[PDB]
Amino acid sequence: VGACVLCNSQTSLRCGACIRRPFLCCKCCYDHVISTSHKLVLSVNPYVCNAPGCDVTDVTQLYLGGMSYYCKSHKPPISFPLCANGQVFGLYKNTCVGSDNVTDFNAIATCDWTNAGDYILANTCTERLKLFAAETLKATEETFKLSYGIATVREVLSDRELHLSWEVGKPRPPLNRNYVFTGYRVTKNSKVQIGEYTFEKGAVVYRGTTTYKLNVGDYFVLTSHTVMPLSAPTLVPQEHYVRITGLYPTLNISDEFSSNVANYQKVGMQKYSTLQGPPGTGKSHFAIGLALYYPSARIVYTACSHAAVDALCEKALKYLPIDKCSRIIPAVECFDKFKVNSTLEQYVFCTVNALPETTADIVVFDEISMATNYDLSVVNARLRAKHYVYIGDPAQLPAPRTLLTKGTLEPEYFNSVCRLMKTIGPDMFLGTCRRCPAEIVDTVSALVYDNKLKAHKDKSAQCFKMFYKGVITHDVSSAINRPQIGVVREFLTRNPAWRKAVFISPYNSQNAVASKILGLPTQTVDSSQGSEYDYVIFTQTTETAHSCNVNRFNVAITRAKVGILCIMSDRDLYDKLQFTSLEIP
Ligand SMILES: [Zn+2]
Ligand SMILES: [Zn+2]
Ligand SMILES: [Zn+2]
């Protein structure tokens, strides 16, 4: 017994072909079963034929006879069809409203999440269907991980390098950082975890959390977890106030945070607020200074990733009383300078999926581009706050969507917060980039910030661009452009001071090749988000949709504090680079 995801009419019916088994009222359930392939209906019991050795589960072919369900062949003389009168039979039949169109639900219920239009629909449908979509998507993503074959340690060639044997008949997952495995130790009659691991083409290079002397027989699977059902909306109802509500500003602030005072007051004058903070504009500084501006307020700092929460902890360690802070960790090495798992402390730092059920004066949700609607709903389910502040940048990278193959996901569809920020605009905008040379700031300001992002630094004269297609090779799931790496090598010989640079590319296999040929530390754009370096050398590698993505390209070039060299494949983005052009030797 539950509530119909389209009507909220009370019902005893859940669609049993939908992987999330959502409640559907007599009408909506009927309109759903008759217009799709979904025919299994679940009640207090399942609408299935109770005959001995019968296979009929289709609700339109079943009858309630006695107090059992039967198909036409096995029904008793007295019975009535379960699925008739434009309605499916179950409890609470009289209270039932129906919907004019079941079209959005059916599409969410039946899609395979490989078309961009699936995520577009999932972020523009009714709020209740946003929750059903976010569950259905995340369950589908978790199930797809089970499709991958087990990888088994066949030979330990060295330390940090292995030799894997793969399960027959199942595909192999890509070997990049977006796929984290878990080892398992072979035992008497079961298995135990041995940490979480990542792999890369060698043999295979493995970068695991904890070191071991792992030997043959150990194996790796992308660890899955149970997806819980959602209840809270992705955003609470907005409320605007005429005075600061539930918060008491300090009367003495320092000139370190004075630039944020007006925004801090805005935070107290509405129920939720959105803060767009481009690279290097002071997002964590903003978030910690909020605590100092409202020194009595209890604040929960949250984000999806442990690294994002830790970075808030590192900023709070600099400005806030360590005794008033606590890092929540469920039973990976994270921040360990606060007391652990103290929910009732004034400042709580905790990832979304480990959040306790509690209240707070302010909730700060950081790196919001990386959130999904599932995360948005979970936060609202766990935390009841006077104020919610969503901090991030819809021009930076989103959570990877593994199932998506047809079409690109635009920032307004990353999640509900990003949609608001791209349609009505963010409540607050951090307009001055303190990190990057002006050539880089001017580029991304025009590229993704509607010319609103201003530079703090001057031009460095150390931002260069080269147009060089090179030669693209592919391995199992990545791309390599050795001629672009050769161009960088020739550049380094003539400019050896650039050997303090970090090498960045959109592809892990490109980085592996560059690490060996150049010796520079390497980062994928996606892994570099949130970090900064004095000098960056970037090879676009290809012109794909992946390597030309403007959020990825924005993140890539905004890692640099002083200088950057971009070897570009795409003529488009090359022409957009307000960098000094260099010639190919
Ligand atoms: Zn309904
Ligand atoms: Zn269904
Ligand atoms: Zn039967």
Numbering used by the authors: 2 to 203, 208 to 336, 340 to 593
Question: What do the authors report?
Answer:
The SARS-CoV-2 Non-structural protein 13 (NSP13) has been identified as a target for anti-virals due to its high sequence conservation and essential role in viral replication. NSP13 is a 67 kDa protein that belongs to the helicase superfamily 1B, it utilizes the energy of nucleotide triphosphate hydrolysis to catalyze the unwinding of double-stranded DNA or RNA in a 5′ to 3′ direction. NSP13 contains 5 domains, a N-terminal Zinc binding domain (ZBD) that coordinates 3 structural Zinc ions, a helical “stalk” domain, a beta-barrel 1B domain and two “RecA like” helicase subdomains 1 A and 2 A that contain the residues responsible for nucleotide binding and hydrolysis. A long 30 amino acid linker that does not adopt any secondary structure links the 1B to the 1A and 2A RecA-like core helicase domains. The nucleotide binding site is situated in a cleft between the 1A and 2A domains with specific contacts to the nucleotide provided by conserved helicase motifs I, II, and III in the 1A domain and IV, V, and VI in the 2A domain.
We have determined the crystal structures of full-length SARS-CoV-2 NSP13 (residues 1-601) in three different forms that represent different conformations of the ATPase catalytic cycle. A phosphate-bound form was determined with the same crystal form but diffracted to significantly higher resolution (1.9 Å). In the phosphate bound structure the two phosphates bind in essentially equivalent positions to the α and γ phosphates from binding mode B, although very slight shifts are observed for the equivalent of the γ-phosphate which probably represents the expected binding poise for the hydrolyzed phosphate product. More directly related to the nucleotide status is the relative conformations adopted by the 1A and 2A domains which shifts by around 20° and adopts a closed conformation the Mg2+ AMP-PNP bound crystals structure, and a more open conformation in the APO, Phosphate bound and other AMP-PNP bound chains. The phosphate-bound NSP13 crystals show robust crystallization behavior and routinely diffract to around 2.0 Å resolution, sufficient for the reliable identification of binders. We have utilized the robust crystallization and high-resolution diffraction of the phosphate bound crystals to perform crystallographic fragment screening on NSP13. We have determined the crystal structure of SARS-CoV-2 NSP13 in APO, phosphate-bound, and nucleotide bound states. These structures are of good quality and the crystals diffract to significantly higher resolution than previous structures of related NSP13 proteins and are thus a good starting point for virtual ligand screening.
